Structures are given as structure tokens and as C-alpha cells.
Design a protein around this ligand. Structure first.
Ligand SMILES: *[C@H](Cl)C(=O)N(c1ccc(S(F)(F)(F)(F)F)cc1)[C@@H](C(=O)NCCc1cccc(F)c1)c1cccnc1
Ligand SMILES: *[C@H](Cl)C(=O)N(c1ccc(S(F)(F)(F)(F)F)cc1)[C@@H](C(=O)NCCc1cccc(F)c1)c1cccnc1
Lengths: 305, 305
């Protein structure tokens, strides 16, 4: 019993983190095979971060200008290129600790573990959701850039996120491992709007299923509803519309609990319209939307990697 | 910016987890040097868990009855003993991945990372506090026993917790690595009272400092108070008494923020007496007490290991 925001075990990702230095800028890189991946803003100086011409900046740089360090071991750079917003540094040595891995572009509302790093060394590990507005609410200081987000499936690490920036609002923006930003963000120090964020409805419902599995039942009501009627209420409270695909994905939790998805939708409506009345669910006084239905099933049947 | 419940990176602990089997019971063990540590209830059968005589049960067992497996590699058991509630299995091989490590008995209100395991394999990693009543609010299924709690200081892992049991209430009890239970708990299937839990006041105050550092300031009031007066209010809301040692430990956060500790105490009193009025602090609609003042300082200056 119990339900917690659990990260993946970070050991396999720890073995790939390196430090990348170019001039005076130091940030984190990801060493897979004989390639090191890092944010291209490593080549930027303080005077060019307002409007960097990355193609012109990268031209003033050669392989020897990139200092890559894995622990105390200095790697030798034999090639550099730019892919979208990431730099790929070809090194003379294949990482002996390279795990089985893919690059994945995650969809909004999916979750992943962040290994926050400084100077190529790990600080800590937390579970995150890609918000509908393609930001994350993380914990990231100066130097955390190049820290990565991942999921694990048995032995394969699926990298989905590289940390690039903090917006003036205090939320976090980054790219996939091909260097394409999630959302409309660019890698320069200019004001950027994340836009209206919404609550991941399917995830809140997964969490209400988690709650019932663990004996929090007080919010279960005698009412049912319709996708259309529920969705009229979703839009009012800035919740993502619920679709039959969402309903289909909750099916295991429905089947487990014998609570029909639309009956949980009616429970959720009463909470949105009435609040929690100073009560709590799984230790929160708010509705939690950072657990996918896969995250509930994983946690509740004790899936190992 | 941002503030999150961050666990330590789990790589060094992953390399020490093994599976321990005795008869039909399988649980997790911790392989350090040539010793494997596990809950002694590994020797118990379903018919003896209500009132195990551990000394009599262990007598019916020999080294060959203990099956220890690190990945697919079967370890050879050349000695077994019982220390309090843990079994120590001497194996023929020193763990090649043994990290620099100590055993530590943690104090109530201290925090640590749990690597939840099944069949000697990691599921995930989360940050926990030892509650004042010596329980933890974790996520643990059948088979999670032997999962460990730790803190890291640069390169040294300090193991503080081994998971033993779930109480009928759904909270979690365990031992230090010398097998001494935190709290009054025993390792048998009998009803056991955790007792009244209290809120870790010093930790709530650290978290209010974290909140101010990150720009949540709405709860800051024009009132001050006294340790004695604050403590009159603490006892009413089941909060631990605040002592000058607590005040002393918050000093860095005081000094950083220029908010006197007793001024934060007055802020906290107004919240306890008035509630949050549907507002939120660092994304919670409740007062959070699972960050130590050391956890705030770590997270806010980006300490790596
Ligand atoms: C990267 Cl190691 C880092 O921590 N950055 C960072 C620094 C510079 C740039 S860039 F170079 F790419 F010029 F473009 F600016 C990106 C990221 C910190 C950071 O985000 N600095 C800029 C903050 C800012 C201000 C106004 C408008 C913006 F879009 C951005 C950083 C600090 C904390 C967390 N992550 C990153
Ligand atoms: C250990 Cl792998 C495990 O998951 N246990 C467990 C099983 C047996 C015992 S024992 F053997 F030591 F006999 F003593 F019971 C301890 C722990 C699960 C568990 O706790 N089972 C007993 C539950 C229970 C019921 C009533 C009163 C009690 F004190 C205990 C376990 C399940 C989930 C999380 N942790 C442990």
C-alpha cells in the first residue's frame, strides 16, 4: 500500500553524464556510444545570449575548443555538428557504460524522471510531466542545462528531454535528444510566453483510481455523467477534454476497481464544482495530474527494471 | 528556480541489491563487501508469521538453505547469523560494486531516499521522512522487504533504513542496518499502534524559507512571536515543539532571506490558525514537512555527489 511520486532508478543515466566546456561556459552532456549531446548555448558568451547567431558562433569553434570530461577522464573531440538546438560532439572513445537506449519525443501529459546535474555530476532525481503547454515544473539552477529526462522499459532507457532554459515565470523548457524544443520556445534570453496550461484529465482520473485502490473512497458519489456533460465542466476548470482513447486507457483501473470511468468522471465533476472541503486524497489537498494510467499500473503491480 | 521532492541518484545503491530466497519466501538483500543483509522474516513460513520464534526457526536452517542471487550470478553462502531483526549472510565474493558506505541510525524528522525493490531489482526511488512516531509513509507492496533508505555525502552512501513491514493502517516500519526497529514495532503479523504522529515544525519552516527563496511571499505577515507563544500554538495543531537548536539550524535560511526565524514562526501561526484560504505554496494546498533545512540548502545551491 501507499502511493508516491516515484522516479526511475537513475544508475544507467548516471553512467552517461559528462561535463562540456567551451570558453567559460560549462554545462552537462549525455555520452552515448562515441557521441556527446549537449545544449548548443554552450558556445554562447554573455554578450550574445540576447540574440545568438548559432551558425556564426559555431563557425568560430573547432574540435579542440570543446572540453569534455567524464569524471577526471578527458575525452578527445574528433568532430562537432549542430542538430537543431543540440551540439553533437564526436569523441575518440565509445562510452563503456552506454545503456540500451532510444531517443523518444514524448507527448503532452506523459511523465518521465529528471536527473538534475551540475558540472556533469548528479544532484538528484524526480518524476515530471510534460504539461499540455509543453513546459515542465522542475528544480533547475544555473548550470543544470543538459540534464536529461527519461523513462525505462526493463533494460532500455528512452531519453525524451534535455533541459535548456528557465522562463521569467520560473518554469522550464527543453528539447528532445534531436534538439527540437517541446513547445514554441527558442534558446535565447528574450521574454517567452508558455501560454495557458490545462490539467491532464486522464491523469487526475488515474490518480483517483490509485486513491480508491489504496482505500481513499470519500469522494465516490452516487452520480454518473456523459463524456459531453463532463467535458462541459472540464473546459470551465481548464481541464483537457476527455476522449474515448482516454476512457480506453483507464480500462484496466475501471476493471480492477469495478468503478465505471464515467462514474469516476461524475466524482471528479463534484470535486471540481465543490472542492475538497478541507479533506485530502493520497496526502494532497489538490487534484494531482502527474500520474499516467501506466504509472498507476506500474506502481500498483511492482514492475522492476 | 523551482522546488521539488528530489531523491538521491540511486546508481550506487542499485549495484548492491540482491535477491534472497529461503524456502518459498523471496525478498531483497543489500550486498556490501562479502556480507548480504536482509530481513530475518525471510526464514518465516505462512504458518509462523503470527508468532515466529526466530532463534528456533533459524536453527532449522543451514548456509545452503539461503539462495542469494545478484542478477543471474548465484552467490555462495559460507556463514549466517542473526543481528536483532536482520540476517547477515557471509558469501564467498566481495561485491565488486561496493560503494564507500556507513550504517547510520537516523533521527526522527531526518529525510532519506528509498529505492523500492522486488526480486532484487529496482522499481523506483522517492524521498521520505522518518516521522516523529518512527514510521514512514512510503509505497511498498508484498516482496519490497529489504528495500533500503539512504543519504549520500559526495561519494559515501549512508544506509539508514531497511523496509520490514506495513501496519494495518497502511504505513511502513523498518530497522537500521544493525536490525534495530525504528519505533516500538516488532516483525510479526500482529496489530501494532504507530501512535500519534506530529508535524516536523523545523522542516515546515525550512519549506516556508524555500517558498520565499522561489517568490511565494503571500503568507509573510507583519506579526512576530515568541518561542513560548509559537509553541502554545504548535501543541494545539500537533506540531513538534521548536527549540533554540531548531532556530540555530534555520540560521542560513534566515541569513539568506533576511526574515528572522520568529517572524517566520508568526507567519506559520497565522497559517495554522487561518488555513491557506484556497491558496497554494510551492504547489501544495497543505504545509509540507518532508524537507530538512539541509535539504533546502542542498537544493538551492546545487550540491552534486
Ligand atoms: C544553462 Cl547551464 C543554464 O543554466 N541557463 C541558460 C543560460 C543561457 C541560456 S541562452 F545561452 F541559451 F543564451 F539562450 F540564454 C539558456 C539557459 C540558465 C538560464 O536559463 N538563463 C537565462 C534565463 C532567461 C531570462 C530571460 C528570458 C529567458 F528566455 C531566459 C538557467 C537557469 C536556471 C535553470 N535553467 C537554466
Ligand atoms: C516482506 Cl517481502 C513483505 O512484503 N511483507 C511482510 C511479510 C511478512 C512479514 S512477518 F514474516 F515479518 F511474519 F513478521 F509478517 C513482514 C512483512 C508484507 C507484510 O507486511 N505482511 C504482513 C502485513 C501485516 C498485517 C497485520 C499486521 C502486521 F504487523 C503486518 C508487506 C506488504 C507490503 C509492504 N511491506 C510489507
Amino acid at each position: 500500500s501507499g502511493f508516491r511520486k516515484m522516479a526511475f532508478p537513475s544508475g544507467k543515466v548516471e553512467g552517461c553524464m559528462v561535463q562540456v566546456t567551451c570558453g567559460t561556459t560549462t554545462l552537462n552532456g549525455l555520452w552515448l556510444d562515441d557521441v556527446v549531446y549537449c545544449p548548443r548555448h554552450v558556445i554562447c558568451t554573455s554578450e550574445d545570449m540576447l540574440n545568438p547567431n548559432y551558425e556564426d558562433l559555431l563557425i568560430r569553434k573547432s574540435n579542440h575548443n570543446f572540453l569534455v570530461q567524464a569524471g577526471n577522464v578527458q575525452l578527445r573531440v574528433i568532430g562537432h555538428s549542430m542538430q537543431n538546438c543540440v551540439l553533437k560532439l564526436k569523441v575518440d572513445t565509445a562510452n563503456p557504460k552506454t545503456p540500451k537506449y532510444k531517443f523518444v519525443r514524448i507527448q503532452p501529459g506523459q511523465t518521465f524522471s529528471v536527473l538534475a546535474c551540475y558540472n556533469g555530476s548528479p544532484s538528484g532525481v524526480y518524476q515530471c510531466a510534460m504539461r499540455p503547454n509543453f513546459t515542465i515544473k522542475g528544480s533547475f539552477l544555473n548550470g543544470s542545462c543538459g540534464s536529461v529526462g527519461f523513462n525505462i522499459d526493463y533494460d532500455c532507457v528512452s531519453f525524451c528531454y534535455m533541459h535548456h532554459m528557465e522562463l521569467p515565470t520560473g518554469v522550464h523548457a527543453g528539447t528532445d535528444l534531436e534538439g527540437n524544443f517541446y513547445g514554441p520556445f527558442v534558446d535565447r534570453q528574450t521574454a517567452q510566453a508558455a501560454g495557458t496550461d490545462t490539467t491532464i484529465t486522464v491523469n487526475v482520473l488515474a490518480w483517483l483510481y490509485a486513491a480508491v485502490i489504496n482505500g481513499d473512497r470519500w469522494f465516490l458519489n452516487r452520480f454518473t455523467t456523459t463524456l459531453n456533460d463532463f467535458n462541459l465542466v472540464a473546459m470551465k476548470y481548464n481541464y483537457e477534454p476527455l476522449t474515448q482513447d482516454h476512457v480506453d486507457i483507464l480500462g484496466p483501473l475501471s476493471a480492477q476497481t469495478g468503478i465505471a470511468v464515467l462514474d469516476m468522471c461524475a466524482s471528479l465533476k463534484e470535486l471540481l464544482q465543490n472542492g475538497m472541503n478541507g479533506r485530502t486524497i493520497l496526502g494532497s489537498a489538490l487534484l494531482e495530474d502527474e500520474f499516467t494510467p501506466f504509472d498507476v499500473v506500474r506502481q500498483c503491480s511492482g514492475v522492476t527494471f
